Subunit: 53 residues, 3 copies
């Protein structure tokens, strides 16, 4: 049914919106965590580099 | 065409579902990897902190 | 309205496509950054491991 199909698509879209917003949250969180870790690892390696002296 | 437009939207939705599920996989993987790296960098810095003594 | 609802869904889909592509970019970037950080932290810990000797 045309109306039935439109209604199913409306629900599908809402479900996708929720999934999409959640994927972004996870991605932004990951972007953040990765940035912090990359900096902290860079810091540990700098400290090691200065160890010879 | 109404039916034609509905059919195109149905296909678009399916494509988005696949893209959405893939973005979540990448995000969750990244969240995991970042957590592990942040911990490992934190560990390296702790070991360095204890180096003075 | 059937046509009105179809038009709203078309716009919703386009918005989701943009959000979906952006979430993937963030996720892939995060995957990359996390990989680099995990390697750099692993490197710092290896260097520390060799410190005893």
């Amino acid at each position: 049914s045309s109306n039935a199909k439109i209604d199913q698509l409306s629900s599908d879209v809402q479900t996708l919106n929720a999934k999409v917003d959640q994927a972004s949250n996870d991605a932004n969180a990951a972007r953040s965590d990765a940035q912090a870790a990359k900096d902290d690892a860079a810091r540990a390696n700098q400290r090691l580099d200065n160890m010879a002296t």
